[PDB]
Amino acid sequence: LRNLWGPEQATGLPLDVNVVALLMNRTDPKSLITHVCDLMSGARIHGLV
Amino acid sequence: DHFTPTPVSYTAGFYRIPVLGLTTRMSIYSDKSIHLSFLRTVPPYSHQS
Ligand SMILES: *[C@@H]1O[C@H](CO)[C@@H](O)[C@H](O)[C@H]1NC(C)=O
Numbered sequence: 001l002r003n004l005w006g007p008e009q010a011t012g013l014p015l016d017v018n019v020v021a022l023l024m025n026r027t028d029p030k031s032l033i034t035h036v037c038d039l040m041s042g043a044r045i046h047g048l049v
Numbered sequence: 050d051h052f053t054p055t056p057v058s059y060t061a062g063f064y065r066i067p068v069l070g071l072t073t074r075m076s077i078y079s080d081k082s083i084h085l086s087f088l089r090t091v092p093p094y095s096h097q098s
Contacts, residue, residue: 029060029063
């Protein structure tokens with residue numbers, strides 16, 4: 001996920017393109033909603049995979 | 050103007066627990082695939098038809 005962004009993305013028409021690769025190995029819903037409210041407030045991330 | 054018990058039922062719905070939403074009688078709560086375990090005790094407006 002880190003190597004897919006560096007040498008690729010040559011035709012980048014937006015400017016606020018930044019990838020965030022995180023690993024939540026355990027998926028209890030309290031921590032999941034915590035990560036949602038942390039990433040959505042984290043400089044307006046528009047991608048949730 | 051939300052009138053949505055959907056975040057409570059979906060927060061308790063990652064464990065797939067039935068949540069009784071008793072706010073309104075909308076037909077969008079009557080779907081089986083959108084609302085898997087959301088079993089209410091109120092009928093939709095199709096019973097008025
Ligand atoms: C999640 O698991 C991987 C190994 O599969 C580990 O490398 C990583 O540090 C873990 N994430 C955490 C706890 O930061």
